[PDB]
Amino acid sequence: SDGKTKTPVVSTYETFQDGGRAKTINAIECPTGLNNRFAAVVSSFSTAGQNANFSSESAKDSQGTT
Amino acid sequence: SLAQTGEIAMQRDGSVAFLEDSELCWDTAAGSAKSCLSVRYDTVGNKTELDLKQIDVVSAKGLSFE
Structure with a gap:
């Protein structure tokens, strides 16, 4: 898209767990070079x-x- | 002496495989511009890539990824 290579966007529904601690979400594995x-x-x-x-x-x- | 070269015919049963980094091409109405694609391997990625970047647009119906 406009000279840059992109992957399709993927979506997740997220809430924080009680305790006010930060939310950990694993990053998707990107193709080589992205x-x-x-x-x-x-x-x-x-x-x-x-x-x-x-x-x-x-x-x-x-x-x-x- | 026979030499098994690139001239070997591709069979409709697919038993014959393409040569490494060879390109499957189409005649296009651009005249003598070829619009090709291939399955390349990037050892600097250990990933197989189905390269269609010679074709301007790829138009599908359904489309799924992982």
Whole structure:
């Protein structure tokens, strides 16, 4: 695409696990001569902080702000 | 003396394999411009590549990758 070689973008639904620790996601294995890219985009959110469970794609549990 | 050269005929049963780095080409309406493709190996990658970069666009119906 415009002189640069690219692989198709692949998508995953991610939430942080409770405990406020960073989320580990494994990088895809790139063909020889290409480098890894990543992007996170906003889907659902509230100001609940730790009092929530958004891990279901079909519903969102939001218990309010601490 | 016979010499098994590149002249060996490709069979419709596929029992005969192409030679390394040989190119399968099409006559195109560009006149005498050939639009080729091949299966190359990059030892500096240990990966097999199906190189279509001589063809401008590849148009598929369904398409899947891993």
